Structure formats: C-alpha cells, structure tokens
C-alpha cells in the first residue's frame, strides 16, 4: 500500500482491501481480455492468488464481529483453550493482512485450529474452522480459478507447460504437506465424535488430490510410461490407500453417514464404497436383495468382485454364502483374477475355507522357544531363557538397548556366514548383475571357502560386503548390524557406514527403471522402529551420500582391513557419489523422495537426528 | 413330480429375503409333518451345497475346535425344520446332527448346537404329535441337558488372569512392580483350581440314542490330552516374564518326575516298530548337523 496515489490503506479494513482487490482483478481482466494465451501460466496465476487469501482471512474475523458481545466472548474462550495445549494466541483484529501464498495460509490456520480443537467445545470456533478450509483450499483454487477463470476465459491450467511440472509457486513441499493432512484430519473427525460435520472437510481433500494427479499426467499428456521411468506425484497419496479407505468407509456405514463413504471412494476410483453402503443391510427387504442379484448377471466381474471386498474383509460372510447362491462361482473367479486391490482381500477367504492357519506356530515353537535345540549341544535352553529375561528390563517391546548389543554383534556374524553357507552347499552363488564384474567377484570366490568356517569379523567389513549380495536376508545383514551395534562406534562413523548401505541401493536402482525400490526400504525402517531401538540414523536425502564425516577411522575400518582392490573401490565410490546427486536434484525424483520421507516421519512423531539418533532412549 | 416341487420351493424361499418373510412362508407350508418334511429338505440341501466346498475336511475326530461361519450354515439347515413345526421329522434329525459333530470331533459345534436347540423337548412333543397322526413308535421320552460341556470352565479360567494383566499393566504404570507379582501369583493359582472345579451331569440322560459312550471317550482322548500337554509347557512359558531369584528346582523336579509313565507305551513299541524309525530320523538329523 505504497505509491504516489495508492494510500497506505483508507477506511474499513475491508474497504481499502476491496480497492486493492479491484486493482488485482482489473489486471487479470486485462490478461484474460488481450493477453490470455500469450502469457505463460506463471505470473498471471499470482493475480488469482490475491483473492484466495482475502476471502479466507476476513470470513473468520467477520463471524465474531457480529454483535460486540460475541467478540468479547471469543477472546476469553479462545485464550482459555490455548492454555490446555500450553500455548497462547488470541485473535481479533490481528488477523487479516493477507500475505501472498496459495495453500500455505490455509496450512498455517488449519494446524492452529486442530491444535486448540481438542479442548474446544465453542461453536463460534467450530464454525470458524470450516470457513477457513473451504474458501482458501477448495474454493480459491477450483471454484475461483479453474471453473470461473480457466474454463471460461484466461485459460492455461497447471497441466499446460509450466516450469517443468507445475508453476513456479508450486513445489515439492506443498505436495508432501497434503499427504500428511489426509490422515491427521481423518483422526480428528473421530476425536470430536461428530464425524458428520467434517464430511465437507474431507471432501475438499479428496477432490484436491484427484485433481492434482490429473495435472501431472496431462502436463506430459498420455498414460504412465514416463512416470514409470521416473516416479513423481501420481502415487504419493495412493500410499495410505487400501487399509485406511476401507476402515474409514466401514466406520461411516452403520453411523449412517453413507454419503461420506461415497465421496472418498469416488475420487480414488473404486465401486467398493458405493456398493458397501447398499449392502449394509442384514438382508432386510426382499425387493432390494433381488435387485443386487440382477446386477450379478449384468456385471459378472466388475460389480461382483467389488462386492466381495466388503464381505470378506469385514467378515459379513453370512451375506456372501446364503442370500447369494450364484456368487460362489464368481468367488472362485475372484481368486483367479487378482492384482489391483483384490489380492489383499482374497487370501483371507482362502485360509478360512480351510479353517486352520496354526502351521506358523509349530515352526516357531522349535526356533523361538527353548525346548528343542542343537543335536548334541546341552545347556542352550538355560542361557537363552536368562538372556531374554535381562533384555526385559525395559517395558513392552523396547528392550534394554545397552545389553542387547554385546550378544548381537557376534550373532549377526554367525547368522551371516550360515546364510551364504546353506546356499554354497546347494551349489548356488549370489551376486548382482552390475556387481558381477570386477575385483569383488573374484575376491568373493576366494572367500567362499572361508564363509563355511565361523569366526568373528568386523561389522564394517560385513556391512560393505553383504549389501552387494542378492537375497533379502543378505541385504538385511547391513541394516541389522548398524542399528544395534553401530552405536558402539562413534556418531560420525555410524552415519558414514549408513550412507554406504544406501549408496549401493542407489546404484542398483539407478541402473533399472524401477524407482519404487528406494521408497519401500526407506518406509520399512520406520515400521520396524529402528530409530527407537539402539539408535539408528533416520532416512534422509542428506544421509544417502556422506562425505563431510572425514574420519581416518572409517578408512582403516572399511577399506584398510577388508581385502578388495583399492582402485576398484575408489571407482565405485566416485560413481556412487554421482548417482545420489542425480535423484537428489532431478525434479521428479525429488518429489517421490521428499513426499514419502516426510509423511512417515510425521505419523510416527520422528525427528531426523545427525547426532545421537535417539528417537526413544 | 417330487423333484420339481422341491427345487421350485427351495428357490422361492431363498429368493425372498428378510427373516420374517422367511419365517411365516416356512411356517405355513406344512401339514401332517410327513410330506411337508420333503419341501423343506431341498432348502436344507442348497444351504449345505453352497458351503460344502468350504466345509472342513475332518470327518474323523481330530483338531477342530470352535464354530466358524461354515458351521453356522449347516446349523441353519436344521433351523428350517424347527420354524415349520416339523417335530415328527425333528426328533430324528437332531440325533443325526449330534452324531456328525461327535464323529468329526467337533465338541464346540455340538455345544453351540446344544444352546440353540435341545433334544429333550423334541422327544416329549413327538409323542403328542403321533396322537393326531397315530403312527406307531416305541416310548421315546427324553430329559437330556448338557454334560459334555466342561470346556466352558477351561475358558472361564483364563479370562480372570487376563483381566489382572490389563489391570496389572495399568497399576504398573509407575507404582511398585513386586506388589503386582504377588497378586499375579494369586490369580494363576486360583484359576488353575477353578478349571478343575465345576461338574455338569445333572439329570442323567443321553441323546435319545445309546452306544455313544465310546464316541465321547475318543474325542476326550484327543483335545483333553492336547490341552494338558500345552499346560504342562505353560509353566515354563510363564516362568520367563519377571526377574526372580531361585525357583528353578521345582521345574527341574517336575521334569524329572515326568519319567514314570504308567500305561505301557514301550510295550506298544515292541508290538510294531517306529521306535526304530525314530533312530533313523535322529541319524539323518545328525548327518546334517551334530
């Protein structure tokens, strides 16, 4: 509000603001009228942004400003609720200022409301949350942009040629923040216990997601084949899919929020939410049940398969069997026709027709229970029982982390030797396709005689060696060694070894057009809660390649005492360093990485360390 | 044409859904309880045919405890008859179900079957029906109640212990762990006695069929001993949760004690071999790893 003839804000805050808004609007009307398709969808889009912001900030403010009594009440109620979360922030007239951003203004607001929403019972407050969400996030972008601006006159959507994916303002951070929000907001509507009111909130998120994915494919046009040679956002919020969708629809069924099921399913493309609503019935009303029977013949795979997902997964097996006689034949077809989202529900039906699944316990009872050991070892049972009891000092799953390591270091060596040994005996040899070559393959064959024997060798040697070998157990041997026993070494030495397990993975990854491999292994680490146990660095993209943790210790541990050709190793290391950088700086490839890392980190209430690496002492 | 009716009817009844619609249509398609039997039987048959492929393969006494969804469909075949007021056919038909359950070793299928329907009523009503039909029969009067049913006391035992454990953990959330052990010790002991108490015999009767005492012995000879063996490993299992000094000799002594068997299994070994087979299997284990 600077200028020769632009006042530093006349009058009512809303009145000057409207003046300003006229100016921004006018500029747009002029880009639409004359210059619409001759101007890139970058700069113009920034004029749209002005409206989005303004709309959201003022609405919130104005509700409270109705009467003088309500405003005075508001200040007390809001201040009091802040105290329960140990924070403070009262609003009026310190809101409205309308900083130029697109979703970010919404993001800030939303967090703040949800924070002091769990203590809140205020209704002015409840009301205020809905208005902020809708105006900025749904309405700003789609209903004050795409519908009423692009699709009439001005045009150039974010699926027409932008920076290299989307406009300048939209970056990786925004996409990742959306992914988080989906699940945190689903939790929140159970919490207030008025799930129903927050359908609308939910609707906006699912809508925004669907639209976005379309933007990605249409920007390059066609079908996935350039997103399958380089993963991006088009699968980054179909991670939380399966489990959560089906759960949330089921929670909604019986509490007769039948509409709420339908939206979630519709945008992510599954007939299951619609079909499950209809089916919610015991079997009541002959007419309706008959109608469902008609639909079996008319759609023998599509309707049929979707319907089974409800009944098998939620075990409403009575409906499945008698009620539907003609669906037994189709139930076999379902097992013979699976992969998209029908394998996951089909196994359960199969093991439950057999009525046993106790096979897993028998095999477990030999190896976990100290009752059947060796073939001429005695005293095993006694040691093993005493050992389990000591690591029981800490409550529940988490064991005393210091006691664990002393046993673990030598065990993981014996188990590593033994795994390849069973393999060698069969006359089978384990190597990767681009690690087939050179000095390591030769060294490996000398070592084959050695691995039969059992002797304690260093974790640094083992880490390096194992990661280049095939097979799941083999690849686990580097992750195992470090999580537990890596914290017997220095912090800097722990991280550098870690980068090295990661680096080999990148090599393999980079060599194939498989881009999902790195994502899965990063995800896996938080599910086994390795950073909570014994300290293990958390997955970062500034953890893959380390080179600022120059220790001579690291040199003498890895390459100074493990026998592999120096020339070769050095060459591999140069190559490793290049490949990590490419994924870390190529736009698509950062989107897949950033997105995936940040959501899992938030849900688990993790913090990336570069010291201690303690997420649970 | 008996076949043609049976099918058209069975399909009509199934294709009319809602439990009340089923109830009345089945109830009022009966008279004389001798050829009304036949109409319902094909409805019985489709109910079984669907779940037939999903039904458990045990047709002999073995491991198979607890009702699943597959069982319940089979129980529903009998429910069709009860709704029809077909007590003539039903008295026979109850005994036949109970025998299949006994023979395939499903004490739990029978037990649950026994809650929803009871034999004893069925035999008394039978007699009254043949006063209006006047078909000859021998005195079939029954007063049967459960007494097969010592398994409910097993499950009762576990649950109190389990309740301590939730509550015990709650108490454990920073308090004093030794006091919690005293209580846990109290619970295991009292539960262990409790399972051994309670006897259901009551009025003495059978299923309205004799020579079924043999069948009941075999079913017991399986599940019963299996559970006993499991429990005999259970002491060891529990003795590995909280750190405690000594108290190892008792276990040692029990182990030693489990050497004075008393039925003659070695005599059985002498009779036909496998004791031998057990050496062959040991030798193959030793040549792989010693």
UniProtKB/Swiss-Prot annotation, chain B:
Coiled-coil annotated spans: 127-147
Entry's localization field: Nucleus, Nuclear pore complex; Nucleus membrane
Family: Belongs to the Nup84/Nup107 nucleoporin family.
Further comment found in the protein's record: Present with 8580 molecules/cell in log phase SD medium.
Assembly and interaction partners: Component of the nuclear pore complex (NPC). NPC constitutes the exclusive means of nucleocytoplasmic transport. NPCs allow the passive diffusion of ions and small molecules and the active, nuclear transport receptor-mediated bidirectional transport of macromolecules such as proteins, RNAs, ribonucleoparticles (RNPs), and ribosomal subunits across the nuclear envelope. Due to its 8-fold rotational symmetry, all subunits are present with 8 copies or multiples thereof.
Protein's job: Functions as a component of the nuclear pore complex (NPC). NPC components, collectively referred to as nucleoporins (NUPs), can play the role of both NPC structural components and of docking or interaction partners for transiently associated nuclear transport factors. NUP84 is involved in nuclear poly(A)+ RNA export, in NPC assembly and distribution, as well as in nuclear envelope organization.
Protein name: Nucleoporin NUP84
Species the sequence originates in: Saccharomyces cerevisiae (strain ATCC 204508 / S288c)
Gene (UniProt): NUP84
């Amino acid at each position: 509000s600077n200028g020769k003839y632009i006042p530093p804000m006349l009058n009512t805050l809303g009145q000057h603001l409207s003046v300003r808004k006229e100016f921004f609007q006018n500029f747009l009307t002029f880009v639409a009228k004359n210059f619409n398709y001759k101007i890139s969808p970058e700069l113009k889009l920034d004029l749209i942004e002005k409206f989005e912001i303004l709309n959201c900030c003022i609405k919130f403010n104005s509700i409270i400003r109705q009467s003088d009594v309500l405003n005075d009440i508001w200040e007390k109620t809001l201040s009091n609720y802040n105290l329960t979360q140990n924070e403070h922030l009262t609003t009026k007239t310190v809101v409205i200022n309308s900083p130029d951003v697109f979703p970010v203004i919404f993001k800030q607001f939303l967090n703040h409301v949800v924070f002091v929403l769990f203590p809140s019972q205020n209704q002015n407050f409840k009301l205020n949350v809905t208005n902020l969400i809708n105006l900025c996030f749904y309405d700003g972008i789609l209903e004050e942009g795409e519908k009423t601006i692009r699709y009439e006159l001005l045009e150039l959507d974010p699926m027409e040629v932008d920076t290299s994916k989307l406009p300048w303002f939209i970056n990786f951070d925004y996409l990742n923040c959306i992914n988080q929000c989906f699940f945190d907001f689903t939790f929140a509507c159970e919490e207030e216990g008025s799930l129903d009111s927050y359908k609308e909130g939910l609707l906006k998120i699912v809508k925004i997601l669907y639209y976005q994915f379309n933007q990605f494919k249409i920007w390059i046009n066609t079908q996935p084949v350039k997103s399958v040679n380089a993963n991006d956002n088009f699968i980054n919020i179909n991670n939380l899919y399966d489990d959560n969708h089906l759960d949330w629809n089921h929670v909604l069924c019986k509490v007769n929020l039948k509409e709420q099921c339908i939206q979630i399913a519709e945008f992510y493309k599954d007939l299951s939410g619609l079909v499950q609503t209809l089916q919610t019935l015991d079997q009541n009303d002959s007419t309706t049940v008959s109608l469902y029977e008609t639909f079996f013949n008319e759609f023998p795979k599509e309707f049929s398969f979707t319907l089974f997902e409800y009944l098998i997964k939620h075990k409403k097996l009575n409906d499945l069997i008698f009620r539907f006689p003609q669906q037994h034949d189709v139930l076999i077809q379902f097992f013979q026709e699976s992969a998209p989202k029908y394998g996951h529900v089909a196994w359960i039906q199969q093991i439950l027709d057999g009525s046993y699944a106790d096979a897993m316990n028998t095999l477990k009872n030999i190896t976990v229970d100290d009752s059947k050991k060796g073939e001429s070892l005695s005293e095993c049972e006694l040691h093993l029982n005493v050992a389990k009891l000591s690591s029981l000092l800490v409550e529940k799953d988490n064991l005393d982390i210091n006691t664990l390591r002393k046993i673990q270091y030598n065990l993981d060596t014996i188990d590593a030797e033994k795994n390849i040994s069973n393999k060698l005996k069969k006359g089978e040899v384990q190597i990767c396709k681009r690690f087939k070559n050179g000095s390591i393959r030769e060294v490996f064959n000398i070592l084959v005689e050695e691995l039969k024997s059992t002797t304690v060798v260093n974790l640094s040697d083992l880490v390096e060696l194992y990661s280049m070998l095939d097979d799941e157990e083999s690849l686990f041997i580097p992750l195992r060694l470090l999580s537990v026993d890596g914290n017997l070494l220095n912090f800097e030495v722990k991280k550098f070894l870690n980068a090295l397990v990661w680096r080999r993975i990148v090599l393999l990854n980079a060599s194939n057009e498989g881009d999902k491999l790195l994502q899965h292994i990063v995800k896996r680490v938080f599910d086994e809660e390795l950073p909570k146990n014994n300290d293990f660095p958390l997955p970062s993209v500034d953890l893959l390649c380390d080179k600022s943790l120059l220790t001579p210790e690291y040199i003498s541990e890895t390459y100074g005492r493990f026998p592999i050709d120096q020339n070769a190793i050095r060459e591999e290391i140069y190559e490793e360093i290049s490949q990590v950088e490419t994924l870390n700086s190529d736009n698509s490839l950062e989107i897949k990485l950033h997105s995936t890392i940040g959501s899992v980190a938030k849900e688990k209430n993790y913090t990336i360390n570069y010291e201690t690496n303690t997420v649970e002492y | 044409n008996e076949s043609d009716c049976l099918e058209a009817c069975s399909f009509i009844l199934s294709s009319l859904e809602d439990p009340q619609v089923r109830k009345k249509q089945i109830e009022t398609i009966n008279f004389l309880r001798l050829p009304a039997s036949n109409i319902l039987r094909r409805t019985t048959q489709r109910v079984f045919d669907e779940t037939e492929q999903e039904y458990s393969p045990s047709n002999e006494i073995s491991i198979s405890f607890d009702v699943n969804n597959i069982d319940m469909h089979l129980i529903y075949g009998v429910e069709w008859l009860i709704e029809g007021k077909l007590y003539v056919d039903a008295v026979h038909s109850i005994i036949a179900l109970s025998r299949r359950f006994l023979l395939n070793g499903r004490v739990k299928a029978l037990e649950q079957f026994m809650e929803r329907n009871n034999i004893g009523e069925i035999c008394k009503n039978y007699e009254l029906e043949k006063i209006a039909d006047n078909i000859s029969k021998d005195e079939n009067e029954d007063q049967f109640l459960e007494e097969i049913t010592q398994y409910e006391h097993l499950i009762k035992g576990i649950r109190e212990y389990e309740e301590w454990q939730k509550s015990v953990s709650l108490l454990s959330s920073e308090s004093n762990i030794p006091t919690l052990i005293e209580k846990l010790q109290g619970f295991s002991k009292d539960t262990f006695e409790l399972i051994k108490t309670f006897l259901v015999d009551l009025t003495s009767s059978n299923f309205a069929d004799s020579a079924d005492y043999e069948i009941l012995y075999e079913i017991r000879a399986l599940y019963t001993p299996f559970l006993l063996m499991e429990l005999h490993k259970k002491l060891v299992e529990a003795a590995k949760l909280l750190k405690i000094p000594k108290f190892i000799s008792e276990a040692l002594a029990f182990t030693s004690l489990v050497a004075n068997e008393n039925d003659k299994i070695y005599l059985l070994f002498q009779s036909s071999g496998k004791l031998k087979e057990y050496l062959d299997l040991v030798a193959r284990t030793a040549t792989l790893s010693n």
